[PDB]
Every structure is written in C-alpha cells, then in structure tokens.
Design a protein around this ligand. Structure first.
Ligand SMILES: Cc1cc2nc3c(=O)[nH]c(=O)nc-3n(C[C@H](O)[C@H](O)[C@H](O)COP(=O)(O)OP(=O)(O)OC[C@H]3O[C@@H](n4cnc5c(N)ncnc54)[C@H](O)[C@@H]3O)c2cc1C
Ligand SMILES: Cc1cc2nc3c(=O)[nH]c(=O)nc-3n(C[C@H](O)[C@H](O)[C@H](O)COP(=O)(O)OP(=O)(O)OC[C@H]3O[C@@H](n4cnc5c(N)ncnc54)[C@H](O)[C@@H]3O)c2cc1C
Lengths: 302, 302
C-alpha cells in the first residue's frame, strides 16, 4: 500500500511527510496525540530560523497546515509494533494495521516531570527542561537545576554563563555524572549544591517564579529559597516502545542510525529526538526529517 | 579575539551564528555579499517547515533580522585564507585579518548557469536548478532537463513523477552518468533524449516559458520545441577556494566533515551546501548550522 509511513507528527515527522508527499510518495502520517509533539508544550521559541519569536503551538499549526494539500494522509494511530516482511513492512496500531514499503520513525523523547505543584503553572514562566532553549532568559538570576546525572551537571555548567548563580539540587549525597563533568562542576565557583533534597513546590506570582520549597529526604527538613528559574533533569527517555525487539536501539532504547537516518533495517529510518544523538532541537529535527525523506524515496525507487 | 567566526551568511551560517551568539560565544559572521546566500536567487520556497510559502529574499530577511539583537557581530569580508595556529586560527580577508578560537565554514555552492537569453527572465517562471525544490510546480508538463551526468539523469528520473514527459538534452552523443543510473533512464519511457545539442534561448510570454530554441553542435541545425519548464545541471561547484590547501576537501573540492560537522582540523567545522554530502536544502543547512554551533561551543569550552 503506502510508499512510506511516518510515525509521529512532531517537527521531524511533519518535515519528513512534507517531503515525501511533495515528492509524490504515497504517504501516511500516524499520530497518537496532537500534531506538533513537544512543540505543543513549549511557549516562546527563539531559535527556529525564520521566526524571531514564535509560540510552540503556533509553530505546530504552521508546520501541520500544508500537509493535507501536499497529499499527506493524516491518520490516528498508537503504533504498538512493526513487522518486516522484506518487500514490505507491517505497522500495527491498537485497532489497525498498515502495509508500507518504508517507515520513518519520528516518535521523539520524553522529559520526566517533577509532578509538584507549580511546575505546570510556571512552565515557560521560569520552569524549563532545556538550557540551550531557555537559559538566555535568566541572565543574572539565581538559577536552580534539579538532577545529578550528566545532563543536570552539564546544563548547570552551561547555565552559569547566564545566571548569577546556579544551584544543583539532587536527591542523593553525591552525583552520578561522569567524573570529568563532575570535576568541571567542583571547579566552577558559581555552582553550589543542595544534597539529599527534592523540590516540593515551585512558587511565584501570577507572572513568574519567585521561590522553591524543598525537603531533605533524610531529615524531613523543609526550606524555601528564592530562585528566578528552574531547569529540570530527572530523566529523558526515548519514545520507541514499539521497536524494542527489532535490534535497532541502544542500551537506553535510543534508535541507532547512520548519518543518512538509516537504521540497520533496510527501509526503516528514524529521525529527530528518538535517535541516539546529542543535540535535540527543532532545527536538527527538521534537518533529520528532510534527510530521511530523501532516503526513503531512494529506497522505494530501487 | 572571537570565540567563533562563521564564514558565510546563508541559512547554514545564519543558524550557526544565531546559536553561538545565544550561547554567549563571542561571535563574528562574515559575508562578502547579501545575507541569505542562494535563498536570494530563489522565488517561492514551499518546503521550509513553518512557512507554507515564502519568497527566498523574504526568508533571508527573517533569518538575518534577529542576529544583531542576539549579539552576532556582522562584518563585511571576502575571505581568502585561513591559518591554523593551534590555540587560535587566523582568517585573512582581502583587506583584513581576524583571530578566533574556532571557525564554522558556511560558504555554500554554485549552480553553473547556461548564460543564454531567457534563463534569467524566466528564473522561477519555468527555469530551475533543483527538482526536489521545484518539480512539484510542473505536473503533467513537457519538461526539459539539461546535462548528461548523474545529477541531470537522476533529477530527470525524479521529474517524471510530475511531468507528462521529460527530455534530457546533452551536448555530447552519450552520457557521463553512472551505468546504473543510465540503465534506469533508458528503461523509463517518459524520458527521451536530444543529443549533441545545447539550448540557445528559452522563450515564453510575460508570465511563463513556452519554448526552448536549441542547436546541434555538430550540425549547426537549430530547433524550437514547446516546453513548460527547464531544469539545468551543467555543473555544481563548492564555493571554498580559501581552504584548498588545508587538506580538508575531497576531489571536487567539497569540504569533508564527520556527522558533527567537524573537519579534520580541530576547531574548524563546515556546514550546509559547502560540505561533501548528498542532500542540499535549507532544512539540512539549518540542521547543519545548529549542530556545528553546539560542537564549536564544546571545542571552545575544553
Ligand atoms: C518544554 C520544551 C521546550 C523546548 N524548546 C525548544 C526550543 O526553544 N527550540 C528548540 O529547538 N527545541 C526545543 N525543544 C526541543 C524540541 O521540542 C524537540 O527537539 C523536537 O520537538 C523533536 O521533534 P520530534 O519530531 O523528533 O519529536 P516530538 O516533537 O517529541 O514528537 C514526536 C511525536 O510522536 C508521537 N508518537 C510517539 N509515539 C508514538 C506511537 N507509538 N504512535 C504514534 N505516534 C507516536 C507523539 O505524540 C509526538 O507527537 C523543547 C522541548 C521541550 C520539552
Ligand atoms: C534557484 C534555487 C532555488 C532553491 N530552492 C530551494 C527550495 O525551494 N527549498 C530548499 O530547501 N532549498 C532550495 N535551494 C537550496 C538552498 O538555497 C541551499 O541549500 C541553501 O541556500 C544553502 O545554504 P548555505 O547556508 O550552506 O549556503 P548559501 O545559501 O550558498 O550561502 C553561502 C554564503 O556564503 C557567502 N560566502 C561565500 N564565500 C565567501 C567568502 N569567501 N567570504 C565571505 N562570504 C562568503 C556567500 O555570499 C553566500 O552568501 C535552492 C537553491 C537555488 C540556487
């Protein structure tokens, strides 16, 4: 049936579908939630070339709008599995099955949340999950980072280029980050640490964050401190449950591809945040989605 | 002096500069011409996610406009050389020199022109140099492709998915393209050939192309035929004369990088159309630029 099925309608998948459909490939775009993916949980985006500033859901609409006129068949699907039959592959959703010559997996990643009062309320008003994205908004402020792995500590060091101070709050008494990243953190004076502690409530006014209430997990001692921003790194997971058995993922479950977005399965490509890679952004998601589209064309051709 | 100098203000270099500046790297963007690069010679762009349609020069302006407010220093420079000195590199322009810790080369490519009457007049009114970019505009039309290499013939093949027919006109009596590509052309019935011929004039009305006059280079014999669009592939060159002696280029002079945009010289990255790669688009230029900015940041930190 399909020349190509794209799983996931975030920026990578919409870019790939735009391409494949424009190139007259019979194109299906599957989505279990809402077009735009993680962009839908974003306020101001200032690093997508072409818009000085644009809101996440605005950009989601902009990217989705042309797809139907270009021929993309949009369809609801919560993809649970994929079978390769050589000449074709089968995609299994909760109520359906699709046959296709090629597959572009574009199902993204999930940023684990704190799930404390205030987190949602102040999302893009002080709460963030990405320093490259948002760090710039907090020049000379007191910045709080939550987490103790490579990500928390690396983004903390990055954020010391903006904040007056960066504080790392971790639930244990030492860090899980690599030694070299740790060494950098201990040498940087603008960083300090709050150990054995977890946040309880993110507080502020109607407009922006003003403080964080936190608790020492060993002692029970509760404390409130002023902070102007909170960056959260309590885990980042691939969203690729439906490929777990296919042999195309790494330890943590990221999809391995070559520079051409090809997985080790012929006709199966992956793009965007779901890939094993080190820079997760709209721009790199778009770049990936265009590349995979060209490769899927080529594959379907030969 | 600088943390990073981006050479070239096309989409790849503008995205890179935007990223480095936002990350507080002391950032210079050098450009000999007009910001936007090849986007300035483009009419409608329909495959840059975020815009259903936008004019090349309009996109250029949207991408250039934020750069100064983010801290990019724009400066005029026709770059002629680069010296690596280990800790720093020197960039030589016709009338100046700059010192920098790192360099992102973003100098693009040049599509060679026919230089015949009508080529400019019907640029984006039937004259094109990129089938993935423009083919969609010629469904069911008589399409003419100029050139005899891998690019002409692969784009011709691609274009048969829109046009009623596709004629390849080559100046010699047989093709330079790979045998496999040639076999595919020969087997595709919507392709035919005009040999030992070159175009002389592209003609039409005030809006669009209606015909092409051409000449048999052996016989002198002239012909006019009706065509609705013309796609030109008489050569594509890197624009990177200022690196020719640095050991970072391939046979044809494309800059070789890894998947992180790294050249074999530390602190020297390259992005976008100038790179050796297979898919030249704004999307992939933007993806490249973002990635290199993040690599430059990392290079400059350690
Ligand atoms: C709060 C926040 C702010 C951000 N700000 C910025 C910024 O300012 N600039 C920037 O460049 N980047 C930003 N990012 C990063 C950017 O949003 C991501 O890099 C980008 O969205 C990745 O796109 P994607 O297409 O790979 O995946 P995603 O956008 O995650 O979308 C994947 C899609 O796949 C769908 N899907 C998943 N599994 C299935 C399944 N089994 N079946 C069907 N559908 C499925 C999901 O619902 C989803 O819609 C931000 C991220 C967050 C969380
Ligand atoms: C007619 C046409 C139509 C196109 N249509 C589309 C489309 O619809 N969609 C799409 O995705 N892509 C399209 N493309 C391709 C797209 O324009 C390119 O992929 C993109 O512009 C390349 O980005 P870049 O930043 O790598 O280089 P470029 O855009 O080439 O920019 C390089 C810049 O570097 C500057 N420079 C070069 N040398 C030096 C030097 N020595 N010193 C200082 N500055 C220097 C140049 O002045 C130039 O401004 C089109 C291209 C053309 C020619």
């Amino acid at each position: 049936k399909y020349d190509v099925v794209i799983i996931g309608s975030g920026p990578a998948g919409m870019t790939a579908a735009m391409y494949t459909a424009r190139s007259e490939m019979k194109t299906l775009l599957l989505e279990r939630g809402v077009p735009g993916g993680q962009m839908n949980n974003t306020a101001e985006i200032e690093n997508y070339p072409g818009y000085e500033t644009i809101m996440g859901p605005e950009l989601s609409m902009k990217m989705a709008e042309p797809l139907e006129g270009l021929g993309v068949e949009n369809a609801y699907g919560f993809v649970t599995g994929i079978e390769d039959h050589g000449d074709y592959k089968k995609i299994i959703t909760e109520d359906d099955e699709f046959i296709t010559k090629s597959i572009i997996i574009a199902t993204g990643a999930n940023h684990r949340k704190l799930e404390i009062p205030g987190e949602e309320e102040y999302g893009a008003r002080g709460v963030s999950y990405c320093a490259v994205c948002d760090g710039a908004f907090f020049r000379n402020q007191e910045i709080l980072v939550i987490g103790g792995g490579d990500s928390a500590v690396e983004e903390a060091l990055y954020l010391t280029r903006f904040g007056q101070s960066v504080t790392i709050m971790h639930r244990r008494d030492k860090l899980r980050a690599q030694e070299i990243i740790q060494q950098r953190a201990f040498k940087e004076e603008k960083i300090n640490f709050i150990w054995d502690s977890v946040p309880m409530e993110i507080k502020g006014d109607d407009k922006k964050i003003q403080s964080v209430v936190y608790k020492n997990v060993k002692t029970g001692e509760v404390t409130e401190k002023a902070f102007g921003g909170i960056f959260i790194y309590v885990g980042l997971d691939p969203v690729a449950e439906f490929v777990s058995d296919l042999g195309i993922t790494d330890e943590a479950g990221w999809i391995i591809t070559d520079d051409h977005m090809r997985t080790n399965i012929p006709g199966i490509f992956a793009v965007g945040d779901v890939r094993q890679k080190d820079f997760r952004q709209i721009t790199t998601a778009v770049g990936d989605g265009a590349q995979a589209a060209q490769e899927a064309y080529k594959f379907v051709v030969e």
